[PDB]
Amino acid sequence: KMTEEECRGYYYVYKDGDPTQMELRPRQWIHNDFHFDNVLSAMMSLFT
């Protein structure tokens, strides 16, 4: 899912990459903890 409006609902995760072992998780639009949205966040990311 490539858009925020697309990233809604639930989806399957597979444990150890086995197609017969799946678990439901809700999908959420996630922002990276260290980003470059403004100069302050960019400076924090560059310091890290």
């Binding site: 697309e6 809604r8 609902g9 639930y10 989806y11 399957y12 799946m22 439901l24």
Partner: protein, 96 residues
């Protein structure tokens, strides 16, 4: 959403409602998107013909429309055998 009465009826080993039709949407398909929501109204006109077919032949079983978008509108209305994640078990049912 709709809360049906769900009387218990024979020829269906479960509780069914004849006042409307039930809609099944696959778990990994988000209900409420533009494609799914557009399908729901134009498929909502099938309930009248579902009721007409039922009343013409009372001994008639499930009538289903399986959409190319993944939806499945079936009559009479009845809860799904395996709901999504209310219990630990999940269902993998795609009408396509």
């Amino acid at each position: 959403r709709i809360k049906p009465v769900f009387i218990d009826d024979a020829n269906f080993r479960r509780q069914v409602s004849y006042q409307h039709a039930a809609v099944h949407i696959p778990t990994d398909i988000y209900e409420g998107s533009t494609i799914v929501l557009n399908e729901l109204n134009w498929t909502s006109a099938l309930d009248d013909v579902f009721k007409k077919n039922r009343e013409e032949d009372p001994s008639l079983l499930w009538q289903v429309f399986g959409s190319a978008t993944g939806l499945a509108r079936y009559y009479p209305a009845s809860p799904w055998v395996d709901n999504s994640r209310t219990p630990n078990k999940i269902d993998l049912y795609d009408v396509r």
